[PDB]
Structure 1
Amino acid sequence: MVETEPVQGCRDFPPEAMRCRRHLFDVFHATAKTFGFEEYDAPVLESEELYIRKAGEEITEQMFNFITHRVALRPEMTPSLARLLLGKGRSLLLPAKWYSIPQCWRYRREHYQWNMDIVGVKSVSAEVELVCAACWAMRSLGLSSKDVGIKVNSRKVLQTVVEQAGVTSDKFAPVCVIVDKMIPREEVEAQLAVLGLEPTVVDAITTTLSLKSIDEIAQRVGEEHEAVKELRQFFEQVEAYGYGDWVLFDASVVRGLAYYTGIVFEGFDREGKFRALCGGGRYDNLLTTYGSPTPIPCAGFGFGDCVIVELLQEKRLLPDIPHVVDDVVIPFDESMRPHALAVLRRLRDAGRSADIILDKKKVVQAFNYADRVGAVRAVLVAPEEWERGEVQVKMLGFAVPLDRLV
């Protein structure tokens, strides 16, 4: 016997499991369409060059890479997106809103991640729309603002604090990667020291993450500080769109990725049971680091397929969806198969989903099968009715003319 289990850390999706994944992906697609995003894709195999950011990101540390040329199964999509945008150059109409549902990889070693990104929008209206899109998808899955929310912050506050301590800007990214981890405080404090931060700088960093309102941020760095102005705009806009109950400020949110420059956010369950449901932020330098002659504003998020499903299971929002089909055509016997095929054809021409019983079996077993596959309707093709130009129809029984079947 071969190994029936999949490769370590990877999932199978037989029809039952696939119906669940499809229910999720439908929402992702429908939400992207509702928001005017365009689908894109790129290869799961990318060059390893793409992912060498040197900030000690967990995402790059756990990279599923190998030698053919140094390549890797993508751990995230954003770098692939950047490559595509960079390739298009001035030919790309901006603003652009691009989305995808890539499988992404790590050495669970795989997950699907809905990505949504807005390109060419300087203003926080980008982050507003992205955050509303994430909420929209969660609400579409049956979740409420009682079940989940999105925590929101700007990295610019911490930037100012780090810069005011005389820290080289090249340490800012690593700092964020470290502060994201806050493991015990003592552990995070120790890691900052290794980067080269004296205890006074660490204290200032700590204090600002524990500030509980935007007003308190304003008191520390000023009301005219970009972060304050931008965050206020952000909440004003989400309030106006009608999702004010879904969003809130949290000064501890920074995310683990090196490239976020401004607003950052993450979805969470209100019971404190699960890891982050989605995460993202503004990354206005990324394309400059890739060699764009002109800076290109960007913001986006990723929304994994594993945590959301667990949450939905806990909330009883993932009932088993049984397979369905409109009609099952049953030949009374093999002499009726050619006539049943003509009927089957007509049913499918009218846009119905139809089976015909393929192997040899008795009518009552054909009916059982029809129930098993969730047929709405059983269409028996018997010699008696056929001579009258009819078939027997049974809902899940009466004679019907062929033209009247559809």
Structure 2
Amino acid sequence: MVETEPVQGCRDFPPEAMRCRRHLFDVFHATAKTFGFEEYDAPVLESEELYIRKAGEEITEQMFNFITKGGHRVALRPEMTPSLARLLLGKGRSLLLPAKWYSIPQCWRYERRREHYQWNMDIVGVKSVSAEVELVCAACWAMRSLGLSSKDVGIKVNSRKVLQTVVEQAGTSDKFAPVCVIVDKMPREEVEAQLAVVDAITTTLSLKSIDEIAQRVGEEHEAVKELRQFFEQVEAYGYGDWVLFDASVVRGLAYYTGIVFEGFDREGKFRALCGGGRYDNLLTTYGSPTPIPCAGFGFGDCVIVELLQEKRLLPDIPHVVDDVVIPFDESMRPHALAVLRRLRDAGRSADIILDKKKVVQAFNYADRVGAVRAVLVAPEEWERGEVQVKMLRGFAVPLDRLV
């Protein structure tokens, strides 16, 4: 027998599991539409070059790469943001701004799971914190659409500019991104050893509010005015109970320059539900002649499902279909087919019993596939221009009155 299990660290999605995934994705799609984002996509396969950032990122360290037969260094994408930037840079001057683009790519890694799907939402060409406001609200919106509340989850919000200022007011301005990557890992003894290759860092990470950080850098330091505006806008949109300040949040990615944020469950049981931030320099580093402000987030398909399961928000939903058409016997098949065509022509989902079987087993089959209605096509009714209809969740009906 063949190996029936999927390849290492990858998931199968038979119909039952696929209905769950599709329930999650319907939300990602519907939230994007609500928020005016436009869908895009790009090859899962990208040049390895794309991801050579040299900051010790976990995401790049764990890159699922290989060499083609032609000798080209390639990778299954570990994230989407670099692909987005390539696309943006490819368009350059022709792309109208601002742009709001989303996608739900499968992303990969090698080392546990080797794949996941990740909802990506990004705003391009918006300088102001309104971009981050909308992104954080979109993530809250999706979580709320899935049945969660602000009692279940929150979004922690910070700015890297603060640490930047503390890095700046202290000793280069060359390695702010590596430091973030290390500080993101916060085993204190281990983290400090990595930073050797500091006290103001730990202190400012532990500062508990905007007022306390305003004391450290001024009531108008770049980062203070943005956060107050951010919290003020989220407040005004009505999702104020969903967001809060947390100075320990920097994220693991090199390219964030400004506001960063992270979704979490309020019980402390799970990893981040989603993660994002402003990355105003990425496209400059890809060789863009003009700086392109950007901001966005990734929202994985696994952590959220665990949370939804824990909260009893992922009930199995069975397959449904409107009609199951049942030939009384094989002589009625042509006529049953004509009825099938009408039902489908009217926008109904409909099966016809494909195999040879007895009526009562056809009815049982109808029940098992979650049919709302069974339509029996029998000789005596057919000559009266009728079928027998029966609701499952039988009285004779004219063919025209079925739809």
How many angstroms apart in 2 are the aligned matches of 1:241 and 1:224? 24
- Give SS of 2:257's match: coil
Deviation at 1:169, TM superposition (A): 1.9
Matched, 1:270 2:266: yes
Matched, 1:405 2:385: no
Deviation at 1:241, TM superposition (A): 0.1
1:300-342: CA deviation from partner (whole Å, max 9, x where unpaired): 0000000000000000000001000000000000000000000
Deviation at 1:112, TM superposition (A): 0.1
Deviation at 1:224, TM superposition (A): 1.2
Deviation at 1:165, TM superposition (A): 1.2
1:146-169: CA deviation from partner (whole Å, max 9, x where unpaired): 000000000000000011112x22
1:49-100: CA deviation from partner (whole Å, max 9, x where unpaired): 0000000000000000000000000000000000000000100000000000
CA RMSD in angstroms, aligned pairs only: 0.7
Deviation at 1:171, TM superposition (A): 1.3
How many angstroms apart in 1 are the aligned matches of 2:127 and 2:173? 22
- Give SS of 1:366's match: helix
2:31 counterpart residue number: 31
How many angstroms apart in 1 are the aligned matches of 2:310 and 2:321? 29
Deviation at 1:285, TM superposition (A): 0.1
How many angstroms apart in 1 are the aligned matches of 2:214 and 2:170? 19
Q: Which runs of 4+ in 1 moved over 2 A?
A: none
1:281-300: CA deviation from partner (whole Å, max 9, x where unpaired): 00000000000000000000
- Residues 305-344 of structure 1: matches in 2 within 5 Å? 305-344=301-340
How many angstroms apart in 1 are the aligned matches of 2:402 and 2:157? 56
1:130-183: CA deviation from partner (whole Å, max 9, x where unpaired): 0000000000000000000000000000000011112x222110000000000x
How many angstroms apart in 2 are the aligned matches of 1:192 and 1:179? 8
Deviation at 1:250, TM superposition (A): 0.1
Q: Any gaps of 5 or more consecutive residues in structure 1? A: 194-200
- Give SS of 1:8's match: coil
- Give SS of 1:169's match: coil
Deviation at 1:187, TM superposition (A): 0.8
- Give SS of 1:112's match: strand
How many angstroms apart in 1 are the aligned matches of 2:58 and 2:228? 31
1:216-273: CA deviation from partner (whole Å, max 9, x where unpaired): 0000011110000000000000000000000000000000000000000000000000
Matched, 1:67 2:96: no
1:196 counterpart residue number: none
1:161-209: CA deviation from partner (whole Å, max 9, x where unpaired): 011112x222110000000000x1111111100xxxxxxx910100000
How many angstroms apart in 2 are the aligned matches of 1:96 and 1:145? 29
- Give SS of 1:89's match: helix
Q: Percent identity of the aligned residues?
A: 100
- Give SS of 2:29's match: helix
- Give SS of 2:128's match: coil
TM-score by length of 2: 0.98
Matched, 1:43 2:43: yes
Deviation at 1:35, TM superposition (A): 0.1
How many angstroms apart in 1 are the aligned matches of 2:309 and 2:316? 10
How many angstroms apart in 1 are the aligned matches of 2:24 and 2:67? 34
How many angstroms apart in 2 are the aligned matches of 1:181 and 1:221? 25
How many angstroms apart in 2 are the aligned matches of 1:398 and 1:22? 36
- Give SS of 2:361's match: helix
1:371-391: CA deviation from partner (whole Å, max 9, x where unpaired): 000000000000000000000
- Give SS of 1:376's match: strand
How many angstroms apart in 1 are the aligned matches of 2:92 and 2:295? 18
- Give SS of 2:174's match: helix
Matched, 1:172 2:176: yes
Matched, 1:383 2:379: yes
How many angstroms apart in 2 are the aligned matches of 1:345 and 1:291? 57
Deviation at 1:369, TM superposition (A): 0.2
- Give SS of 1:300's match: strand
- Give SS of 1:378's match: strand
How many angstroms apart in 1 are the aligned matches of 2:348 and 2:321? 8
Matched, 1:93 2:96: yes
- Give SS of 1:90's match: helix
- Residues 234-313 of structure 1: matches in 2 within 5 Å? 234-313=230-309
Matched, 1:109 2:106: no
How many angstroms apart in 1 are the aligned matches of 2:361 and 2:329? 12
How many angstroms apart in 2 are the aligned matches of 1:159 and 1:312? 36
- Give SS of 1:170's match: coil
How many angstroms apart in 2 are the aligned matches of 1:288 and 1:223? 30
How many angstroms apart in 2 are the aligned matches of 1:86 and 1:16? 40
How many angstroms apart in 1 are the aligned matches of 2:155 and 2:94? 35
- Give SS of 1:335's match: helix
- Give SS of 2:313's match: coil
1:22-54: CA deviation from partner (whole Å, max 9, x where unpaired): 000000000000000000000000000000000
